[PDB]
Amino acid sequence: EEPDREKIKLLTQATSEDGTSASFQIVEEDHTLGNALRYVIMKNPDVEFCGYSIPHPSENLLNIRIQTYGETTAVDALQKGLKDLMDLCDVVESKFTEKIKSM
Amino acid sequence: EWNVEKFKKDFEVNISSLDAREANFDLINIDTSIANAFRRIMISEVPSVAAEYVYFFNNTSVIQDEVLAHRIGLVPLKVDPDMLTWVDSNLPDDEKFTDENTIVLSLNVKCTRNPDAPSTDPKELYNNAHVYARDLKFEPQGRQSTTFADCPVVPADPDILLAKLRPGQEISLKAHCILGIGGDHAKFSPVSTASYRLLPQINILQPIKGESARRFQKCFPPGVIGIDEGSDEAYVKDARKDTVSREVLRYEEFADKVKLGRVRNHFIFNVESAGAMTPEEIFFKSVRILKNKAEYLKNCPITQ
Amino acid sequence: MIVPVRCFSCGKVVGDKWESYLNLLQEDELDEGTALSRLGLKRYCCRRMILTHVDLIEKFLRYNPLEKR
Amino acid sequence: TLKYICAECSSKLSLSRTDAVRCKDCGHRILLKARTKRLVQFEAR
Amino acid sequence: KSLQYLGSYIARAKKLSRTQIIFVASYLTSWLNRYVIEREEEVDQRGGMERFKHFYAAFQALCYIFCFRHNIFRDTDGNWECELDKFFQRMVISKFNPLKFCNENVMLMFARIAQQESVAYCFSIIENNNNERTRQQFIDLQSYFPYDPLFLKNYKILMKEYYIEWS
């Protein structure tokens, strides 16, 4: 097959040598994914710094930055916040399925 | 502190009403960034079917060709999506429109003078004077004859006045209706207004029983504040009923005894539709897009 | 020209309510306030699309160059 | 099938070689060109 | 690009003598152990791994020979020339980590061979190195091979006498 290799992109000019302070660049995204993903990364007790940034509104690029206190990289913290964003959309989908049954 | 099992305990949905067109429900104990993400996907990401390419053979009416094409694309079609797949605009037009992608609609109208005696109404005076959106006839190109035979393609609002004619004039076109999202163009947006309001909170501080209780009724919508006497004095019955008019702060009698605030986690969504899908189903489709918007990043190589 | 298909601000389909609105005012003899509220228009962005429409296509269709006189 | 239209009587009209530019029913000099079934395409936007 | 032309020339050449194969790799191992104190102390210093692209190429040219000419260095007794059975696994455990920064094919082609030919074991390190996860001009100078087989057909007939295929 062929995994898509232009969507997520780690910017090595802003990336730490340990791996714990990195900045990613996602194409074709906006505040929708970025503000929802930042909420979920910031609930990790090991995350020190997290915020997103849209550089210019005319192109559809999303920079997010994660900094951790050590003992977890910014890629291990990005993928916990991608897991819990999936598992949060599976609680909203289940409570709303039951109440349609419960009418 | 936050957990994905503590979110499951505190999150609740209260569906207020539901219809074939609109759906009012609640989201208790969810974040403003998550609730805004569901709002955006219903407007800008849930796909719909709309006329993208319009092919005029003749148009001898008054309405211009590029205006009359634009009015066809804004018609909501009652196609169920995922019966179509997505078009591919990197390969040419002879390869691009297969019947798995495209729904073909056509229009053939000619206006003639009607023999009638009487100022008189122009539908008792001409033939095919007004062109409605139900004159877009579905042409099942290919294998669409058997899979769109339970549900034919027809506009959700058939009485959309598309054009008007006079005798001599004609409109003869054929449109190609394709699948797309509403961040491309506003015609592929499935929803009239998918939007939330945040739950109002009316914090009484001092008791306002007596004459104060009668005019503090009239600072709010007629079912919000309740009164009995000095006994069972003044309280909120339904804060969801309250429009936030701030009409009680313009009176110096009550500008100290109440703090209007919001419950910052209780959202009140009002999802509507154009008519293609049901508004409880453009919310399941929206909560699953954000799920798949993060599966696509978890299962992706971190380049460079 | 003709009534717009959709409202500009919200996106409700509004194009099917122009010939309905003219018969509400002519035959039922309603005011403009109740006749807009009967048609399911209740956002002021969406009220003014039917409320404040000119419909100049009736003046443009008087000039038919295909029909004699 | 050749088709023009006269601007006065709206009588549809053909115009060959060595003709006057006049209508045949009326005597009108201004005479406008009709449109036929021919393909034009539009992005409905 | 010059080291890239070195390893592909020694490997894909039928008429090269047995002493000339090793004498390239003798000098190619002489460059890599003179490197052992002169620049191996600079790894935890400041400056990323782009500083050692000359080292990351000359190691790869030596590992390109072991993928194609392992069977000239060895006698029946097994005595490897310049002690390759000591050399590779001492350079793999170096601070530069030369199994992560070289080409994905030729360093894995080295991994399925140095286990069999009993020189160095590295399937627990390439397993390790890809689990941690400017450059595109350096990937593609490693991917390029000067002496790949020929798209021309009447000229390869001459080259059949001169050129070593895959096996």
CSV table of C-alpha atoms in Angstrom, one decimal, chain B residues 56-61 65 170, chain D residues 3 5 33-38 40 42:
chain,number,residue,atom,x,y,z
B,56,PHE,CA,-27.2,24.6,-21.0
B,57,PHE,CA,-28.5,23.7,-24.4
B,58,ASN,CA,-30.8,26.7,-24.7
B,59,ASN,CA,-31.8,29.5,-22.3
B,60,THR,CA,-34.0,32.1,-24.0
B,61,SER,CA,-35.4,33.4,-20.7
B,65,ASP,CA,-27.1,31.5,-17.7
B,170,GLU,CA,-37.3,28.1,-23.2
D,3,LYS,CA,-32.6,32.0,-37.8
D,5,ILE,CA,-35.4,37.7,-35.4
D,33,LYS,CA,-29.7,37.1,-33.9
D,34,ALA,CA,-31.4,34.2,-32.2
D,35,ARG,CA,-29.7,31.4,-30.2
D,36,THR,CA,-29.8,27.7,-31.0
D,37,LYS,CA,-29.4,24.5,-29.1
D,38,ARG,CA,-25.6,24.7,-28.5
D,40,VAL,CA,-22.4,25.9,-22.9
D,42,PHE,CA,-21.3,26.4,-16.0
